């Protein structure tokens, strides 16, 4: 019934020293029924990464929409969109459906190509921006993620340390949520290299 918890899933994003990390589970379901273990919720447009939890049809629709919009942006601006600018675009796009919204919990992550500054941001379904320094959480196990992140997180972590922190935050949160899990992916993002890692976890 509740659109934001039919399909399930989670996204978490964290900042580190000269790096950001964004991660998600791989589950898609129809309430109790597990349907897919390969449903990735993180996308990227140039160097800007976007995670989207919530109603899966809207996740897909919004990804296609932001690919559309960032492609036209690039053609006209003659440059790739930045995380700060893209965050405003996501917010604008969600609020234009104020009284008929996409049932999603987007999470932006990336490094500004000019300043080199790590950036993360979160949104409610209606476009309100949460620009936290430390971490952003989203999905059906967001409470669990808030608990994991609040205790596990410390500032200025190195890329390979940050990987361990965000991975453990995601995994243990998903294991306390029926509608999350079935695999996980973690992106470690630096100014000019990005590493993608699939995690091994329990498949129930």
């Amino acid at each position: 019934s509740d659109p934001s918890s039919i399909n399930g899933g989670i996204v978490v994003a964290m900042t580190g020293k000269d790096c950001v990390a964004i991660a998600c589970d791989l589950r898609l379901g129809s309430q109790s029924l597990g349907v897919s273990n390969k449903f990735e919720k993180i996308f990227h447009y140039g160097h800007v990464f976007l995670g989207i939890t919530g109603l899966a049809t809207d996740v897909t629709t919004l990804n296609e929409m932001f690919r559309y919009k960032t492609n036209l942006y690039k053609l006209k601006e003659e440059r790739a969109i930045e995380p700060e600018t893209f965050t405003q675009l996501v917010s604008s796009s969600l609020y234009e459906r104020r009284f008929g919204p996409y049932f999603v919990g987007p999470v932006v992550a990336g490094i500004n190509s000019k300043s080199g500054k790590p950036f993360i941001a979160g949104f409610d379904l209606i476009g309100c921006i949460d620009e936290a320094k430390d971490f952003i959480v989203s999905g059906t196990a967001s409470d669990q993620l808030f608990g994991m992140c609040e205790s596990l997180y410390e500032p200025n972590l190195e890329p390979e340390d940050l990987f361990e922190t965000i991975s453990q935050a995601l995994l243990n949160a998903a294991d306390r949520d029926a509608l999350s899990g079935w695999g996980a992916v973690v992106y470690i993002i630096k100014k000019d290299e990005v590493v993608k890692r699939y995690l091994k976890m329990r498949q129930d």
Binding site: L28, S36, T57, T60
Partner: protein
């Protein structure tokens, strides 16, 4: 309607769909084909609310056939599935949404690969080795999880499909009057007339 199954094997896609049409208290038909050929190498089965199912399927069919004539070219299963998803995603926020779930089984002639796509009425698309809609998966997925292999032959796929149908016939309360089975491969679409 009720039960629609799909399984992608080595070199083909197999779609099984129930024959029953029940309108309330009586079973009006026991030989209904819940599928439409979108293009020579792409088949779409469907299940959902009465009227909407066939109206939607035929609307998609007409659009793909129109594209085929205009460009003198067959769209890839992936392209067809994306078109279908968008129509359903458009539909869900309409005045009166199409209440239709579909499976799209196609053979990509460019990549020489079979492909099975599962799309529900919300526009939720997933590419799968095997799929179902409604309660069908609840009975069959445990068997498919166990026996399925990506290098299965068409004959092995049909045997695994028979086991799934047998489990449905045993544990489902509703009599779905058996299934029509169709195979989609490099040579096109054909029906298994004995099942």
């Amino acid at each position: 309607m009720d039960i629609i199954l799909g399984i992608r094997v080595q070199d083909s896609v197999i779609l099984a769909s129930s024959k029953a049409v029940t309108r309330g208290i009586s079973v009006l038909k026991d030989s209904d084909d819940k599928t439409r050929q979108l293009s020579p190498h792409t088949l779409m089965s469907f299940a959902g609310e009465a009227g909407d199912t066939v109206q939607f399927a035929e609307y998609i069919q007409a659009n793909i056939q129109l594209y085929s004539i205009r460009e003198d070219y067959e769209l890839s299963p992936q392209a067809v599935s994306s078109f279908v998803r968008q129509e359903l995603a458009k539909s869900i926020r309409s005045r009166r949404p199409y209440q239709v779930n579909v499976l799209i089984g196609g053979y990509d002639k460019k990549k020489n690969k079979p492909e099975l796509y599962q799309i529900d009425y919300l526009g939720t698309k997933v590419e799968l080795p095997y799929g179902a809609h409604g309660y069908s998966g609840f009975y069959t997925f445990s068997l498919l999880d166990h026996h399925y292999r990506p290098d299965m032959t068409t004959e092995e796929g049909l045997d695994l499909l028979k086991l799934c149908v047998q489990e449905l016939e045993k544990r489902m309360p509703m009599d779905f009057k058996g299934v029509i089975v169709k195979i989609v491969d490099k040579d096109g679409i054909r029906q298994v007339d004995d099942f």
